[PDB]
Amino acid sequence: EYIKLKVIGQDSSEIHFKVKMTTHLKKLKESYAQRQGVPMNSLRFLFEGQRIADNHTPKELGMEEEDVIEVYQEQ
């Protein structure tokens, strides 16, 4: 199963990702950073305010269709 996730940037822009429930979200982080032209390690990705790990899957985080991921600068 795939779901569509909405990634909201620091500037309120959006990129949506169709991601398999078993795919490690590292792959989404890499794609987003590539498209923003910044290093992946300059960013932190949050779901419901909690940090998304490289090896988190959407299934592990209980994500559903049209759930939101927020991107902030790394601290």
Binding site: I15, H16, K20, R35
Partner: peptide, 12 residues
Amino acid sequence: AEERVVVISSSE
């Protein structure tokens, strides 16, 4: 901005 949907492949 237009809608942007990226398909993430299953290969890692």
